Design a protein around this ligand. Structure first.
Ligand SMILES: CCS(=O)(=O)Nc1cc(-c2cn(C)c3c(=O)[nH]ccc23)cc2c1ccn2C(C)(c1ccccn1)c1ccccn1
Length: 127
């Protein structure tokens, strides 16, 4: 099985804006998670071909990863902060669907999710 193409990260047919919360999502939230020890498996799409995971995209139909999220932020793909937060939540939940509770990769995702929720509790004031 091939890998799927990565999620779209630019779309010139969508209106674009910078906002306090989107800037925070890139410069604080994504930045903090990216530098975490456990971030590395989540910095690019799951490369099922490389990892020999023939069953991954058989069940994960909304793949998401922080590299995609970073690119989306950098390309002003998101209008609302919730659209970005939803992508982080999808990334975590994919991990909790494919892998058994308590597995290494799940424990990595849970640590990142705890940190993510902490930083989301500090989102700046909306315009
Ligand atoms: C940067 C993304 S990548 O695809 O190129 N590299 C890796 C990704 C992933 C990966 C990411 N996600 C979200 C999952 C998941 O949900 N289940 C299983 C594997 C993975 C794991 C990668 C690796 C590399 C080694 N590995 C490991 C060593 C791995 C896992 C499975 C098969 C082969 N190698 C790995 C790393 C951490 C914890 C456990 N295993």
């Amino acid at each position: 099985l091939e890998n799927p193409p990565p999620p779209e990260t630019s779309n010139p047919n969508k209106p674009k804006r910078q906002t306090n919360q989107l800037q925070y999502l890139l410069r604080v939230v994504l930045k903090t998670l990216w530098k975490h020890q456990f971030a590395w498996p989540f910095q690019q799409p799951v490369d099922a071909v490389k990892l020999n995971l023939p069953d991954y995209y058989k069940i994960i139909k909304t793949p998401m990863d922080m590299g995609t999220i970073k690119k989306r932020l950098e390309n002003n793909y998101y209008w609302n902060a919730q659209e970005c937060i939803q992508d982080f939540n999808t990334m975590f939940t994919n991990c909790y669907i494919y892998n058994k509770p308590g597995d290494d990769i799940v424990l990595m995702a849970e640590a990142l999710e705890k940190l993510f929720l902490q930083k989301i509790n500090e989102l700046p004031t909306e315009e």
